[PDB]
Write a protein that binds this ligand. Structure first.
Ligand SMILES: *[C@@H]1O[C@H](CO)[C@@H](O[C@@H]2O[C@H](CO)[C@@H](O[C@@H]3O[C@H](CO[C@H]4O[C@H](CO[C@H]5O[C@H](CO)[C@@H](O)[C@H](O)[C@@H]5O[C@H]5O[C@H](CO)[C@@H](O)[C@H](O)[C@@H]5O)[C@@H](O)[C@H](O[C@H]5O[C@H](CO)[C@@H](O)[C@H](O)[C@@H]5O)[C@@H]4O)[C@@H](O)[C@H](O[C@H]4O[C@H](CO)[C@@H](O)[C@H](O)[C@@H]4O[C@H]4O[C@H](CO)[C@@H](O)[C@H](O)[C@@H]4O[C@H]4O[C@H](CO)[C@@H](O)[C@H](O)[C@@H]4O)[C@@H]3O)[C@H](O)[C@H]2NC(C)=O)[C@H](O)[C@H]1NC(C)=O
Ligand SMILES: *[C@@H]1O[C@H](CO)[C@@H](O[C@@H]2O[C@H](CO)[C@@H](O[C@@H]3O[C@H](CO[C@H]4O[C@H](CO)[C@@H](O)[C@H](O[C@H]5O[C@H](CO)[C@@H](O)[C@H](O)[C@@H]5O)[C@@H]4O)[C@@H](O)[C@H](O[C@H]4O[C@H](CO)[C@@H](O)[C@H](O)[C@@H]4O)[C@@H]3O)[C@H](O)[C@H]2NC(C)=O)[C@H](O)[C@H]1NC(C)=O
Ligand SMILES: *[C@@H]1O[C@H](CO)[C@@H](O[C@@H]2O[C@H](CO)[C@@H](O[C@@H]3O[C@H](CO)[C@@H](O)[C@H](O)[C@@H]3O)[C@H](O)[C@H]2NC(C)=O)[C@H](O)[C@H]1NC(C)=O
Ligand SMILES: *[C@@H]1O[C@H](CO)[C@@H](O[C@@H]2O[C@H](CO)[C@@H](O[C@@H]3O[C@H](CO)[C@@H](O)[C@H](O)[C@@H]3O)[C@H](O)[C@H]2NC(C)=O)[C@H](O)[C@H]1NC(C)=O
Ligand SMILES: *[C@@H]1O[C@H](CO)[C@@H](O[C@@H]2O[C@H](CO)[C@@H](O)[C@H](O)[C@H]2NC(C)=O)[C@H](O)[C@H]1NC(C)=O
Ligand SMILES: *[C@@H]1O[C@H](CO)[C@@H](O[C@@H]2O[C@H](CO)[C@@H](O)[C@H](O)[C@H]2NC(C)=O)[C@H](O)[C@H]1NC(C)=O
Ligand SMILES: *[C@@H]1O[C@H](CO)[C@@H](O[C@@H]2O[C@H](CO)[C@@H](O)[C@H](O)[C@H]2NC(C)=O)[C@H](O)[C@H]1NC(C)=O
Ligand SMILES: *[C@@H]1O[C@H](CO)[C@@H](O[C@@H]2O[C@H](CO)[C@@H](O)[C@H](O)[C@H]2NC(C)=O)[C@H](O)[C@H]1NC(C)=O
Ligand SMILES: O=C(c1ccsc1)N1CCN(C(=O)C2(c3cccc(Cl)c3)CC2)CC1
Ligand SMILES: *[C@@H]1O[C@H](CO)[C@@H](O)[C@H](O)[C@H]1NC(C)=O
Ligand SMILES: *[C@@H]1O[C@H](CO)[C@@H](O)[C@H](O)[C@H]1NC(C)=O
Ligand SMILES: *[C@@H]1O[C@H](CO)[C@@H](O)[C@H](O)[C@H]1NC(C)=O
Ligand SMILES: *[C@@H]1O[C@H](CO)[C@@H](O)[C@H](O)[C@H]1NC(C)=O
Ligand SMILES: *[C@@H]1O[C@H](CO)[C@@H](O)[C@H](O)[C@H]1NC(C)=O
Ligand SMILES: *[C@@H]1O[C@H](CO)[C@@H](O)[C@H](O)[C@H]1NC(C)=O
Ligand SMILES: *[C@@H]1O[C@H](CO)[C@@H](O)[C@H](O)[C@H]1NC(C)=O
Ligand SMILES: *[C@@H]1O[C@H](CO)[C@@H](O)[C@H](O)[C@H]1NC(C)=O
Ligand SMILES: *[C@@H]1O[C@H](CO)[C@@H](O)[C@H](O)[C@H]1NC(C)=O
Ligand SMILES: *[C@@H]1O[C@H](CO)[C@@H](O)[C@H](O)[C@H]1NC(C)=O
Ligand SMILES: *[C@@H]1O[C@H](CO)[C@@H](O)[C@H](O)[C@H]1NC(C)=O
Lengths: 128, 105, 439, 211, 128, 226
């Protein structure tokens, strides 16, 4: 137990085992028209705003309320040719995001439709 | 104590198979085998680690296999630069690399 | 070898950003200008998490917490002055004389006794009252006629005499989904990759102390004394010296002043300086000549690391400018001192008892940003004596090199405390390949 | 300048307050002055007193502003009757040229003393000069106030008298004189001349006649 | 990337004790072990030992147990993921049978079953 | 160790320079400060001026216009000159040793101090009278006597005060009582001094008066006997 962001320098495989320690600090903390009130309130709205933006994607991919979901889109190696032991036992999430940064918007696309069509297939299957 | 092939060779297009074996102190099932391409007196190169996993960038022609008594290193479709000496490693997580004798191809 | 995208929520990855930081203050209850009563309470366990194996790059000169804090301090002051009494009827013609004389030739005019006609609580009646004014708040007309310094430039507003200017610790915090990154490297230049990093919810207790030349009651270096600037080779970029040993400074205004409530109008009272009980002495500050010599000696050694062991540097006094720039200006116990620092930087250092500083007092202090708004500080009764640490300096090279102090930009004060901190946003969504597939 | 009276009983403790308060830190001097005599410095710094001055003379030190400069005469005696001056110096006021008002200490409870009247007839050389003067000499009385009346035989005479106001002797008692001037004929033509000195309630008389 | 330059190829006679340097670049020096391996002419290549440029933990072959001294000094941060380090190594009871070319090599990964495995090698240094 | 003696004319006419001297005995003159003080009837003690040890002058603004204080360090003689004398200027003029005191309330560097002066040793004083009236010597007559007995002398008609009287050229000092003078309507004082004596000593211990009135430079003496 290293704490919030404690494994930020640890390997992707290691940090992936302490995901709740970052998940619970995503909308809690300590956050009249005075300058401190105008300040403290928009800090309250900004936290809930960004939290629901991430949860919306997590829902539109079919991963609502789970910290690790497997998907159906395959890994286009042009995103990252690196190997599994080269990733999870070598790189940290910070440098990984720096490498895969451009393709995230693309990956977020096929994740969106892979669920929207899977929702359509389970509805055909349940029609029997 | 970890003996490999005396020597072998082929021709451009075919394959070769270097062996690697020893007693129950150096090999095998309880230890991981790694293979190194090593030109004499110069910078070596990792080609295979823990018995078949190849280092990044290694061409898919190189292949590793490990029987219960001896590890193998297949080098299919040979090409000129493969004229080299090859050594095998024997190692666990918390120890060192027990290198092999040698094999020139 | 079938690799699939695997979504991860809660991945330790952040990116630099800008967000609105809110204040936290400890429990202590009257009300200070910093409205610290309106801040959330701080946790008595300021949880700090050490980020093992992490190295982040900092840049205190592109930091935003400073630029954000600077506007907060300004807004807090405009908020505090808003409901207090306007002194526009005080912009009259003043018939002034010197107060009791019989001593040093040209310090009799340093403070004047001034009579003037003033509004009363009834519209058709006037009242001739008198008040003691410092020399630095009035100008002549040319006869013994005088006039407040601000009447031609700005409007005037007196501070509600209940709000205290004594600065108290502020804790700047980041909202949820964000985080503050502390750099814990004891030889940190202020810029570049910091090897020892930790994350905190809020910064430490930062006193919003506004001083000049000398940095008072600030944080101390843990080792050495650090010198910081954007471009030290550029002579137009101030140097922020930070001591590791505090050099105490004792300031006092000895004259036992008296407050005289004057009814300017209905519900509007003007607090004038009534009389001086006892002797009329001089306001001044002491700093131990020995320690100020020593700690000015560790400044020059770290100064040479950028200018040469054989090069000889020297300290001079402020080359001019506005009053708040050419003097160690600060607020002590309520009144605004302006202490001539010539007796502190007057030394040339070569390859290899206490001093006293005459201070003057203003009560018409104006804004360093826009000219057009100015405050009257109501006179504090009794004898003033505050004792403070000098924890840093603000020097300036000229281009043998000479260093003179200065700096009338408030946000240099905040950089001396916010250099360790950095605000980043968390992005808990991460995608990566795995051999697991849905269904 | 104008004079402030103060009357303390003998043996008690006089407290002489300074007539002019100090605006800042002060350096006050106390002088003792009996008219027709050199003033003597009692206390120079607010509390320091020169040698030859007893401990019964004390002045308040300037330790904190607010204290009032007061000279304290403990165990008053008849020799303490004098004008007392407060030479007040301070930080805020300028040059203290004036010694200030005078507080005239009169010590009460002194014992009543009767006069010692002595009359003299005109001298021969005086009568030779066609001028005759009788001299009545009163001394050693307290309180210092006497009435003098001259009597030619039984009838009173008041033309020609010249009487001195009382004046303190070194014995702390008072003495006075009076001179009846007259022509040498009205000295011989009369039977006798008498000097009647009434002090407090009683009258006393000494007489003389040309013989 | 990553590159490990070594010292010069100078020679000395038996009984002495020599030090060889290894200067790393292009990678976090603290994240991977540093390994030293010798290619003697009259023997097979022999692994000498590795140390942790982070935990300071060392481990040598028993044929070098009381005769070798392997150290490292702290890294200099260059960027968030690039450092510059140095790795030093000496031999005590040294003769001329220890002649050969000497290499320094950093570890493979920073977790797993092949953490310290010599992956990225140096230029080599000719000896006595 | 240090005493002080005034010296004056006793009379000066209206509109004329009044000159006085003061001779120190026992100490140096150019080492101390010296002040002049005068006491007129009714008016309190009046500080006239003072001179420094380095002989700097400073006069009371009450009479700064018409006063010049000097000093002659060849001996220990200090002088005073007062021009344009009028009737109100008649007083008993004292001179005294002023000692400089330095009262320090704040910081000496800022000059937060002041100087106070105090006269610690004084002279005996000298009487001067302002009157256009002329001087005149007395006319001492004997007052012959007749358990004890008393005898005296009648110093008649002199102007102005003072008159010094001693018995037996200074030998007889006990029982002497010199009475304050009498300003007669004619405008000139008259004094009498007597001495109480044992009755038996009348024969024949000669008792000799000694009258001095220096304003007229008339020294007289006379005897008494039944
Ligand atoms: C920042 O830095 C600043 C600078 O460093 C600093 O400023 C300092 O501030 C303080 C306070 O604010 C100042 O302190 C004051 O000091 C005054 C001077 O004191 C010195 O001098 C006196 C007198 O010296 C004469 O007499 C002595 C003998 O006694 C001789 O030896 C001297 O040579 C000299 O005499 C010769 O010289 C004269 C001038 O040339 C001639 O006129 C004379 O004829 C001779 O030729 C000394 O007595 C003092 O000694 C005492 O202190 C030393 C250490 O210094 C000690 O060992 C010991 O305790 C000694 O007693 C000293 O050397 C003081 O006058 C002043 O205190 C008086 O004033 C205040 C305010 O008015 C009063 O409240 C206070 O109570 C004092 O009053 C007493 O004394 C006066 C004068 O006699 C009396 O009138 C009065 O009634 C009272 O008397 C009572 O107490 C006496 C004892 O105190 C006692 O004797 C009496 O019997 C009676 O009971 C005050 O202390 C200081 O000067 C500033 N610094 C400088 C450089 O100026 C600031 O604080 C710093 N900090 C900040 C800003 O936070
Ligand atoms: C920060 O960054 C550093 C640098 O990357 C990280 O340090 C590395 O961590 C990884 C995993 O945490 C380490 O890999 C492991 O290596 C050990 C080998 O060490 C063992 O053998 C030593 C020699 O015999 C022995 O001394 C050790 O025993 C104790 O002594 C040391 C003394 O310092 C002490 O520090 C140790 O902690 C031990 O208590 C030790 O036993 C190897 O055993 C591991 O293999 C096991 O685990 C893996 C999975 O982790 C598993 O797959 C295997 O099958 C086996 O079960 C593992 O390979 C690496 O050695 C560290 N050092 C480097 C890379 O230089 C650090 O973790 C980072 N921390 C954070 C918070 O980010
Ligand atoms: C500032 O200037 C004002 C003048 O406008 C001063 O006020 C005046 O001060 C004098 C001197 O104290 C006062 O006279 C005094 O009056 C009291 C009470 O009657 C009397 O006891 C004193 O003897 C003296 O005569 C005067 O009344 C006063 N007038 C007003 C309108 O205040 C003031 O003192 C000056 N203050 C300072 C700090 O310089
Ligand atoms: C640097 O910090 C110190 C301490 O935190 C500050 O000293 C503080 O100064 C104020 C005002 O001078 C003091 O308030 C006063 O306290 C006295 C106590 O007797 C009281 O009488 C006054 O009415 C007033 O309340 C405060 O106590 C004091 N703090 C301490 C611990 O001494 C100093 O002012 C700071 N420096 C600057 C430049 O702000
Ligand atoms: C001036 O600096 C000193 C030294 O840093 C301060 O004294 C320390 O204060 C802290 C906070 O109260 C304590 O934790 C330390 O134990 C103190 N050490 C010593 C030796 O005193 C002092 O408080 C500072 N003063 C001001 C006004 O900032
Ligand atoms: C400043 O002056 C005020 C008055 O002008 C002083 O107040 C007095 O303080 C004493 C304390 O012992 C009280 O007993 C008095 O009643 C107070 N009087 C008034 C009118 O307030 C105060 O003490 C002075 N302060 C200093 C440091 O000298
Ligand atoms: C500033 O003032 C403080 C207190 O007024 C001084 O600190 C005191 O120093 C003495 C040394 O003699 C100690 O005994 C006290 O305990 C200290 N007081 C406190 C509250 O710590 C200090 O020396 C002064 N410094 C200067 C430069 O004037
Ligand atoms: C390995 O060699 C290094 C040489 O750099 C030794 O480090 C120094 O050893 C001396 C001798 O005891 C110490 O005095 C120094 O403090 C050590 N450090 C440095 C930076 O010089 C090291 O001791 C040797 N290995 C062992 C196990 O001793
Ligand atoms: O305390 C000091 C100080 C200390 C030593 S000299 C001055 N301040 C710094 C200078 N200053 C300002 O510029 C402000 C301001 C805000 C609102 C109205 C006005 Cl008039 C002025 C912005 C704060 C005044 C307050
Ligand atoms: C990978 O992506 C590229 C473009 O992003 C696309 O053209 C290509 O067909 C993809 N390959 C596979 C195997 O999906
Ligand atoms: C580990 O990640 C770094 C980051 O780019 C990379 O340089 C290195 O080659 C990786 N390790 C392996 C064994 O590929
Ligand atoms: C105050 O005093 C100084 C110096 O004595 C003088 O120059 C100035 O004119 C004075 N001012 C007034 C208003 O009296
Ligand atoms: C107040 O007004 C009057 C006009 O009646 C003027 O004479 C006086 O000077 C004014 N007061 C002051 C202090 O100027
Ligand atoms: C106001 O008057 C002062 C008096 O010197 C002058 O310096 C200043 O420039 C004036 N302000 C403006 C805006 O003119
Ligand atoms: C600050 O220190 C860093 C640390 O390496 C250095 O790279 C940089 O050049 C320094 N900048 C200045 C202005 O001193
Ligand atoms: C610093 O200033 C010098 C000249 O003052 C300039 O040449 C140099 O480019 C500046 N540094 C940077 C980083 O711009
Ligand atoms: C200056 O002196 C220091 C001593 O600490 C030394 O380390 C540095 O190398 C010297 N530099 C020069 C240029 O002399
Ligand atoms: C700086 O020092 C010089 C030399 O004494 C002086 O003339 C000047 O007034 C000083 N300036 C300031 C702002 O102290
Ligand atoms: C600062 O002090 C020096 C000497 O202490 C003086 O010459 C200079 O004039 C002062 N500066 C100002 C602006 O008064
Ligand atoms: C400045 O230094 C010179 C030389 O030491 C000295 O004479 C002067 O008094 C000093 N000025 C101040 C204000 O310390």
């Amino acid at each position: 137990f290293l704490g919030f962001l404690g494994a930020a320098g640890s390997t992707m495989g290691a940090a992936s085992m302490t995901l709740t320690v970052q998940a619970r600090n995503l909308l809690s903390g300590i956050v009249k028209l005075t300058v401190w009130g105008i300040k403290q309130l928009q800090a309250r709205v900004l936290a809930v705003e960004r939290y629901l933006r991430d949860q919306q994607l997590l829902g539109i991919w079919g991963c609502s309320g789970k910290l690790i979901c497997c998907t159906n889109v395959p890994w286009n190696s042009s995103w990252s040719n690196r190997n599994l032991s080269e990733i999870w036992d070598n790189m940290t999430w910070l440098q990984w995001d720096k490498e895969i940064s451009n393709y995230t918007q693309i990956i977020y696309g096929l994740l969106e439709e892979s669920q929207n069509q899977q929702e359509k297939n389970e509805q055909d299957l349940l029609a029997l | 104590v970890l003996t490999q092939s005396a020597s072998v060779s082929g021709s451009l297009g075919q394959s070769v198979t270097i062996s690697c074996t020893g007693p129950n102190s150096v090999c095998c099932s309880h230890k991981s085998i790694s293979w190194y391409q090593w030109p004499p007196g110069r910078a070596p190169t990792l080609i295979i680690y823990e018995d078949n996993e190849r280092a990044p960038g290694i061409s898919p022609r190189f292949s590793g296999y490990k029987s219960y008594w001896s590890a193998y290193l297949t080098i299919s479709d040979l090409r000129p630069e493969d004229e080299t000496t090859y050594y095998c490693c024997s190692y666990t997580h918390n120890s060192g690399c027990v290198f092999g004798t040698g094999t020139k191809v | 070898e079938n690799l699939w995208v695997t979504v991860y929520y809660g991945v330790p990855v952040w990116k630099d950003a800008e967000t609105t930081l809110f204040c936290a203050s400890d429990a202590k209850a009257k009300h200070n200008v910093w409205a610290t009563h309106a801040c959330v309470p701080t946790d008595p366990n300021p949880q700090e998490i050490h980020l093992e194996n992490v190295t982040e790059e900092f840049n205190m000169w592109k930091n935003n917490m400073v630029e954000q804090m600077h506007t907060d301090i300004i807004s807090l002051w405009d908020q505090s002055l808003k409901p207090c009494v306007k002194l526009t009827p005080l912009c009259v013609t003043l018939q002034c004389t010197n107060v009791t004389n019989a001593i040093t030739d040209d310090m009799r005019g340093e403070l004047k006794n001034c009579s003037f006609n003033m509004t009363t609580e009834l519209r058709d009646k006037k009242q001739k009252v008198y008040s003691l004014f410092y020399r630095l708040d009035v100008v002549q007309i040319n006869n013994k006629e005088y006039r407040l310094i601000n009447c031609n430039t700005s409007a005037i507003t007196q501070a509600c005499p209940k709000v205290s200017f004594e600065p108290i610790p502020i804790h700047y915090c980041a909202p949820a989904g964000f985080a503050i990154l502390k750099c814990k490297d004891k030889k940190f230049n202020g810029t570049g990759p910091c090897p020892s990093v930790s994350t905190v919810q809020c910064t430490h207790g930062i006193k919003p102390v506004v001083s000049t030349q000398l940095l008072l009651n600030g944080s101390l270096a843990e080792e050495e004394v650090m010198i910081r600037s954007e471009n030290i080779t550029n002579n137009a970029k101030n140097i922020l010296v930070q001591f590791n040993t505090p050099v105490q400074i004792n300031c006092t205004r000895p004259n036992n002043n008296t407050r005289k409530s004057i009814r300017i109008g209905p519900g509007q009272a003007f607090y004038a300086t009534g009389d001086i009980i006892g002797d009329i002495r001089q306001a001044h500050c002491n700093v131990s000549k020995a320690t100020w010599n020593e700690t000015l000696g560790k400044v020059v050694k770290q100064l040479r690391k950028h200018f040469g062991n054989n090069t000889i540097i020297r300290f001079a006094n402020s080359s001019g400018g506005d009053l708040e720039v050419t003097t160690h200006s600060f607020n002590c116990g309520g009144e605004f001192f302006y202490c001539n620092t010539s007796g502190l930087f007057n030394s040339t250092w070569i390859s290899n008892d206490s001093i006293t500083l005459p201070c003057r007092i203003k009560q018409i202090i104006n804004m360093w940003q826009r000219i057009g708004q100015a405050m009257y500080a109501p006179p504090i009764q009794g004898v003033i004596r505050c004792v403070s640490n000098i924890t840093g300096l603000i020097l300036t090279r000229d281009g043998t090199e000479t260093f003179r102090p200065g700096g009338g930009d408030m946000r240099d004060n905040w950089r001396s405390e916010l250099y360790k901190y950095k605000v980043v946003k968390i992005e808990p969504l991460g995608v990566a390949p795995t051999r697991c597939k849905r269904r | 300048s104008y004079v402030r009276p103060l009357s303390v009983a003998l043996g008690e403790t006089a407290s002489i307050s300074c007539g002019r308060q100090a605006l800042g830190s002060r350096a006050v001097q106390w002088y003792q002055h009996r008219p027709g005599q050199a003033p003597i410095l009692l206390i120079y710094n607010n509390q320091d007193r020169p040698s030859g001055i007893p401990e019964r003379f004390s002045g308040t030190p300037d330790i904190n502003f607010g204290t009032r400069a007061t000279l304290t005469i403990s165990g008053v005696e008849a020799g303490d009757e004098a004008d007392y001056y407060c030479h007040m110096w301070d930080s805020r006021s300028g040059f203290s040229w004036s010694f200030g008002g005078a507080t005239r200490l009169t010590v009460l409870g002194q014992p009543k003393a009767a006069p010692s009247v002595t009359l003299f007839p005109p001298s021969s050389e005086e009568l030779q000069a066609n001028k005759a003067t009788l001299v009545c000499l009163i001394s050693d009385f307290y309180p210092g106030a006497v009435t003098v009346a001259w009597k030619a035989d039984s009838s009173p005479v008041k033309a020609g008298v010249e009487t001195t106001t009382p004046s303190k002797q070194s014995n702390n008692k008072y003495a006075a004189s009076s001179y009846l001037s007259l022509t040498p004929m009205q000295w011989k033509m009369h039977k006798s001349y008498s000097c009647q000195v009434t002090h407090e309630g009683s009258t006393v008389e000494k007489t003389v006649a040309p013989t | 990337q990553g590159q490990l330059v070594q010292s010069g190829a100078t020679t000395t006679k038996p009984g002495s004790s020599v030090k060889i340097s290894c200067k790393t670049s292009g990678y976090r020096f603290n994240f991977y072990h540093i390994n030293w391996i010798r290619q003697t002419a009259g023997r097979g290549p022999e692994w000498m030992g590795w140390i942790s440029p982070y935990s300071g933990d060392k481990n040598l072959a028993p044929a070098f147990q009381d005769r070798v001294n392997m150290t490292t000094d702290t890294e200099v941060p260059v960027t968030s993921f690039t450092s510059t380090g140095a790795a030093y190594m000496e031999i005590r009871n040294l003769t001329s049978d220890d002649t050969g070319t000497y290499f320094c090599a950093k570890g493979l990964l920073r977790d797993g079953s092949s953490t310290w495995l010599p992956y990225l090698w140096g230029q080599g240094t000719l000896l006595t | 160790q240090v005493q002080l003696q005034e010296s004056g004319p006793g009379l000066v006419k209206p509109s004329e320079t009044l000159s006085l001297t003061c001779t120190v005995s026992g100490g140096s003159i150019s080492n101390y400060y010296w002040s002049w003080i005068r006491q007129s009837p009714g008016k309190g003690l009046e500080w006239i001026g003072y001179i420094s040890d380095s002989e700097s002058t400073n006069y009371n603004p009450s009479l700064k216009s018409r006063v010049i204080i000097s000093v002659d360090t060849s001996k220990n003689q200090l002088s005073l000159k007062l021009n344009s004398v009028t009737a109100a200027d008649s007083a008993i003029y004292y001179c005294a040793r002023a000692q400089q005191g330095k009262r320090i309330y704040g910081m000496v560097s800022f000059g937060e101090f002041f100087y106070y002066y105090y006269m610690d040793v004084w002279g005996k004083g000298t009487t001067v009278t302002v009157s256009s009236a002329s001087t005149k010597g007395p006319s001492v007559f004997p007052l012959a006597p007749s358990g004890t007995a008393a005898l005296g002398c009648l110093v008649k008609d002199y102007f102005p005060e003072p008159v010094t009287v001693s018995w037996n050229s200074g030998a007889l000092t006990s029982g002497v009582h010199t009475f304050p003078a009498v300003l007669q309507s004619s405008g000139l004082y008259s004094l009498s001094s007597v001495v109480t004596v044992p009755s038996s000593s009348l024969g024949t211990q000669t008792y000799i008066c000694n009258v001095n009135h220096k304003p007229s430079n008339t020294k007289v003496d006379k005897k008494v006997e039944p």
